[model samples]
Target: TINYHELETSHGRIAVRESEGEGAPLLMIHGNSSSGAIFAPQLEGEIGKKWRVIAPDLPGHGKSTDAIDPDRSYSMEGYADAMTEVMQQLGIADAVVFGWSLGGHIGIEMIARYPEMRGLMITGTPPVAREEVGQGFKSGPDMALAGQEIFSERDVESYARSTCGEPFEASLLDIVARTDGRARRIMFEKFGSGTGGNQRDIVAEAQLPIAVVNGRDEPFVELDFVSKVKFGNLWEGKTHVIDNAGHAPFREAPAEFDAYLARFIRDCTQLEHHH
Candidate 1:
């Protein structure tokens, strides 16, 4: 079962979700506007039995307290710093981080900035320019609008429909619609606006283990291009494609997604323990 907890940080009180398993740490981060609760499968599935999973609602999203300095504290650096502090308070000395969308960007930043972060598994996120990865998403202004718009049930359903590869779970649809638009605005406008492009370059020379998973229906990245992306010290053959899934592969196929992560974590055990 998933457990809930709260902690004090420089930012303020924040909410966290954790699995009951007493095993290796898995730090999962969610996309913009969404909460860590999106990882419900892992929280409620077999992955939770083998790994200690923890997901946090970044400031201004879900149950997390809104940032005291919404503009400054909502930036990439601010969110990363907050995660570092939160983990420290929780006594997690190190972890294998999984990031989805904007969470992936934050994971890249964490791997680049903190040596304690052993490896990265990014799903549906591009660390490079959108064009470099064949993504033409125009969500910046849309996200700004999401922040400003109070979504009606239909509006939420429409938005949720846009993100699924298959029929979205009813609760998942509700989760998507319930996300805070103001937080989405902060994510796209201040934090994600053209940030993390350098992370692509960072990955070229990064020494840690790297895994990039893209879905066939998710055009956020070009499948052929990612398969060819070579990192300086990437563990052999880590790129993956989840078939018949959309932007949210984990939502569509959590078992498959979690299996990929499980394999990577097993392979990176040496690195996870020593690094």
Candidate 2:
């Protein structure tokens, strides 16, 4: 069984779910409109056997306390800092970082800003350029308001249908409600303001190993397009598109996602071994 713990950061209290294993730590970050609870599939699955999984709920999300900052910056940079503080408090010097959706953006920022990470794994996220923010999705106060209103409803089925392309199962619906409306709005505002959209440049310039995974049926971000545009430039970057899945591939097709993730990690671990 996994144990849950809380850590106090400069911003507020954050919740972490710890699962015991033998190898190096694997830190997982959940995206907007979801919490670390989404990682339950991974925690109970095969990946749990080889890794010490540490999944955390970002500030104002899941079991974590709401934001203490008056401005509620909640930008990608703020999230990266909070995760860094969490790692520091836990005495985790280095680990494989896996992030999904908005969490993937945060992971990119963390890897770009901090050199302490062992490697990075990102899923279902794309780096939006400054010029492309308002092109597809409007940003700022209006976006924040929209996110708040959209996620405020108690009906997770409706929310999932509108956001995700895959079928909305009862279990997944339960996970969506645990999502924090305020944090979603904050993140929407930050992304709309072009805070987390420039990560492609950072990843392109990074020398460290990077694994980019996306769902085949995801509507918003095209994996092949992003792979060609971003990963093609990196020396140690790889991309995997999981079939029979949508925006949240890990949830939609857990086995396929896990297999790809396991292969990627095995290769990465071996590379690290050689180095």
Candidate 3:
């Protein structure tokens, strides 16, 4: 079963969901306008039994309150710093982090700044430099909405539908609407202004294992661009693309996604013990 709680952090009262386990930590971060509940399958599935799965609602989304300092808590760097506090307060010394969509961007930031991060798995996030952002993400009406500051009733529905590439759950729609619009706008502005670390550079210099997994049919990211990026230690020597899955592959194909995740964690754990 999954358990829930709230933590008082530098950001605000942040809500978290945790699976019952004493194993190594697996921190799953959700994407834009979404909550940690998106990882329900991983929280209740086989991986939950073997890993201490902890998923937190980012500030300004889900059960979490709006950022106490919006400008300082919404950008990739801000989210990364805020979540680092979450990890410390929760006694997570080191962890294998899984990030989806915007969450993946935050993961890249964490891996760049957080020294204790053991490994990283990013899905639906193309690690691009500031100049390459346009090259990494496909252009479309839905993609345009990703960084928009406002959402109408119809915008919420359209975004939710495009993200999942199917009929969205009512709860998912609720979180999408509930997200503080400023979070989206400010994050984008910071990204455009070159606020966070250069993602491609970090990946190129990283010594730890970095896994780039994506759905074969991902709607937002360009798979061709993702596969071409150089990695210092890319897992299995290539990006793992799940067949028949879209942006949210873990939610869409938990079994296949978990297989790759489990293997990576095993390798990381072994390396941690050796050192």
Candidate 4:
């Protein structure tokens, strides 16, 4: 079982799940309307055993308390700052990162600012230019709820299915219901208004290795748009699209997803020794 603790951060009292390991730090960030618990598969599997896994419930999600100041704590950049504080307090000078969906957007913000970040692996996230953001996502009723603040029971259920795919677990549904509505609202508001850095440029110019993986059956993101983005160091020479999976491929196809994650972690660790 992963150890859980409450971290007093600048944002608020955040809940963090840490696995026991002496290996390199592997920070995992969850998506919008989700919590660190989303990574249970990876955290309780071989990845957790080999690498120190640190996953936090972003403020207003999971077991974490709501942001102390919603306006200052709800945007993409704001969340990145919060996570930075989490790492700083934990004394992690360097780490590899895995981000999903909204977490991917926040990871982009972090990679641009944190020189200590060793590498990043992102899924269900499209790094697009500000003007091209719309082109990276599909337009649908379900997509609209991604940024909506208020969610009815059906809204939460629909969202859970959309992101987690069919046969959504009860825990995922509960997490969706527990999310702070303001997080979703203010995030999209600021993101659309150009609050965060230009992710497209960052990914293209970043010196650190980046792995872009997504489900071929992804619902929200446009695969073509994501594949076209110029990553400075794309893992395995291209974006990976897993079959029989949707947005959260890590959960839906843990074996297949873990294979890539394990390889990336090993490669990045070896590179650190040589560098």
Candidate 5:
């Protein structure tokens, strides 16, 4: 059975949802402008049958309380620390951390600083710096123009179409409305600088198995860029590209996403042959 609860962190209050199982612990971190609610499909699906999945609303997002500091200034490292604290509060010693988009960036910091993590999974986010791709926040006023009106009659299909490429179903708009504006702005200000850092150094140095997944038609970051930086360079990790999907493959192709995730988890869980 899955249960939902709250945990107090340095940043603010966080909402966490957990589904019961006996295998490895899976911690899901959502992207910018999103919360744990977006993983509803995975939580209600077969993945929950094999693993204890815990998804938390990143600080200042969803049902969680907004940041206490008005300046926002919540760095990816801060979010990573909050996630690590959440894990500690849950008594989880080790877990398979899956992060998507902005969430993936925070996961990198967590895995880099915390040696107790078991494995890592990053989706729809490149390890490269943000400036290399010319990514940045739309100006405050511009963002206001682009923002969705909460509680409006908008549909998920319209939301998905606006954000993704063609062939996206309209049922995903509900997930779009839960984005945390303050946290997103803070993230943009912090890591949106440049990609000059050693992109693969963190994952390459980690002892845990790593998997990278991307959408075939990702827009914000180049799919090939991710391939080159992580897979091509490291050759120690694995990568997957879902066809006909854009940035949000999990929403556009839930079944396929679950299948890919399940296979990866199974491979990681298998024990080595005895000598």
Candidate 6:
């Protein structure tokens, strides 16, 4: 089962979601303008069966209090601090991070800012200037403009479809409809100003476990960009591509995504055990 709770961080009150499983912790982070609520598929899922899953709405989104520093501080570095503060409050010493879209950027920030992070697995986000990744990324708003309300059901449904090669879960529709537009626009604009930081500088030098999983039909992030990921000292050899899937691989193809995550967790933990 899934449970909800609140935490008082240095920033403010944070809304969190936790699964019932008693295994290792997987910090599930959502993308731009979306809340932890978007992770409905994995809330009490099979992955949850094997791992204690915890997700939080980033500042200014979902149930989290407004941003501590919305304009200049919502970047990965600051976001990493938020996660650290929350985890610290809960006495969670370490955890593997699962980031999607903008969430992935925060994961890199976590790994870079917090050495205690165990491993990283990301999906739906393009590397884009993040060394050994997307070298030829196109410049644009950080996320799709669906939350802006400049678009409608017609446009929103199509945008939703872009992230899933297979049918979307019913809750996905609700996630899209209730998304906060102001929070997204500001955060997206913030990232465009380089708030996300130089990813290539921060992540490629990583010495811990890192995995990039992309849906082959991802339109926001080109499959070529994600597939070509090469780290200078990667714990593993390469990236992953889930077929019949789009931006949100976990939601589009939960079974396959779960298997990949399970194996990664086992391998990384075993490696940690030996070290």
CA lDDT of each prediction against the hidden true structure: 0.72, 0.71, 0.89, 0.90, 0.67, 0.71
TM-score of 3: 0.97
lDDT of 3 by residue, 1-275 (tens): 89999999989989999999778889999999999998888898888888889999999999999999998899988999988899988988689999999999999899866787888999999999999989999998898788898899989998998786543688878989999999999999888787989998988898778999998999899999999999888989999899989898887888999999889888887554552
- Tens digit of lDDT per residue, candidate 1, span 1-275? 68899988888788999999787888898876678988888887887788888999888777887787766567566677788888889988678888887788788778755677767888877666434533423333233343444666766766566554565667756566666565566655543355543666777878878888878777444566666666656655667788878678887887788888888777765443453
lDDT of 6 by residue, 15-54 (tens): 9999988888889998765678877778778878778889
Better of 1 and 2 by lDDT: 1
List RMSD in Å for every model shown.
3.2, 3.5, 1.3, 1.2, 4.7, 3.2
After superposing candidate 1, which stretches have Cα over 4 Å from the reference?
129-154, 164-167, 191-197, 228-230, 270-275
Error of 1 at 185 (Å): 2.4
Candidate 4 lDDT (Cα, 0 to 1):
0.90
Residue 239 of model 5: what lDDT?
71
lDDT of 5 by residue, 44-137 (tens): 7788777888999887767777776624326677788788888888999678788887778788888755677766788867775555533322
Q: C-alpha displacement of 95 in model 5, angstroms?
A: 0.5
3 or 5, greater by TM-score: 3
Candidate 3 runs further than 4 Å off: 271-275
For every model shown, the clashing-pair count is 1, 0, 0, 0, 5, 0
230: Cα error in model 1, Å? 4.2
CA shift of 20, model 1, Å: 1.7
- Superposed Cα deviation of residue 113, candidate 2 (Å): 3.6
Q: What is the C-alpha local distance difference test score of candidate 2?
A: 0.71
